[PDB]
């Protein structure tokens, strides 16, 4: 199916306590593969998936060089943004940046993105055409004017359409057993009495990959969206994901209820019933 590569960067200032903390992480789809943490001992980009450990020293040296340069640009940025917004030197602030690319089923370029936030709010974001920027205020319009200039525009375009796509495909190939897999959810249902007149039915999806899934309850074929407790999809920690959906059912009505599961690993969506 479709795939993406994304890098996520977080920089947090801590005034009086020296240098801003900087964290970088890289994902292919829902699988983390690299990290850097400025507070760690190594000062290196480090592998976080077995399939990227195969990359040689030139890869690790070059990624380490670049991620430290990223780190430095963010350190500068925190100061610039404090200047832009007339903020005091004493408060802690956060910048976040995400960039990357999507490919479709044919592994051809679909979309490129580059987005930036200050203190949890949209600051500037690259539009889908890859030339124009959405600036969220006046300060961001100042940045927009810097990032709009001829040479800088082409360079980001050459990364997002070219390099990001090439490297995504290389990773997909090199990490095939992990990245090109589809793990169908293992599903079951539990029933617990909450009183003598009501019970909870909970529909479980476990051990699935990728994270995208739909779990829904119906009563007599009617969606119970407003009465379903649906938890956020959550990592099991072994590279797979979990989700559940629960309904409270009056006693005797269990057979009216159906749980419906859609996932790319399932050739047909599943319908499950307590019976």
């Amino acid at each position: 199916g479709s795939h993406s590569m994304r890098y996520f960067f977080t920089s947090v200032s801590r005034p009086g306590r020296g240098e801003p903390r900087f964290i970088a992480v890289g994902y292919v789809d829902d699988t983390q593969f690299v990290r850097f943490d400025s507070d760690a001992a190594s000062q290196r980009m480090e592998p976080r998936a077995p399939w990227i450990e195969q990359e040689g020293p030139e890869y690790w040296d070059g990624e380490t060089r670049k991620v430290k340069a990223h780190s430095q640009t963010h350190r500068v940025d925190l100061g610039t943004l404090r200047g832009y917004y007339n903020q005091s030197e004493a408060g802690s602030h956060t910048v976040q940046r995400m960039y990357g690319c999507d490919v479709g089923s044919d592994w051809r370029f679909l979309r490129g993105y580059h987005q930036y936030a200050y203190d949890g709010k949209d600051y500037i974001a690259l539009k889908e055409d890859l030339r124009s920027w959405t600036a969220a205020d006046m300060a961001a319009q100042t940045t927009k004017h810097k990032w709009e200039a001829p040479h800088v525009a082409e360079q980001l375009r050459a990364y997002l359409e070219g390099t990001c796509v090439e490297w995504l495909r290389r990773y997909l190939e090199n990490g095939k057993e992990t990245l090109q897999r589809t793990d169908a959810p293992k599903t079951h249902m539990t029933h617990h009495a909450v009183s003598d007149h009501e019970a909870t039915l909970r529909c479980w999806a476990l051990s699935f990959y990728p994270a995208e899934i739909t779990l829904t309850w119906q009563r007599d074929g009617e969606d119970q969206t407003q009465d379903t407790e649906l938890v956020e999809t959550r990592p099991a920690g072994d590279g797979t994901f979990q989700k559940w959906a629960a309904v409270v059912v009056p006693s005797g009505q269990e057979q009216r209820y159906t749980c419906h599961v859609q996932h790319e690993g399932l050739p047909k969506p599943l319908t499950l019933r307590w019976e």
């Binding site: 890098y7 970088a24 890289g26 990624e63 670049k66 991620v67 340069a69 990223h70 640009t73 500068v76 940025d77 610039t80 943004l81 832009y84 960039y99 930036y116 600051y123 500037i124 940045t143 810097k146 990032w147 800088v152 360079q155 980001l156 990364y159 390099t163 990001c164 490297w167």
Partner: peptide
């Protein structure tokens, strides 16, 4: 692979 050519805000 990271992008190698970042610009300041």
């Amino acid at each position: 692979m990271l992008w190698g050519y970042l610009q300041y805000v």
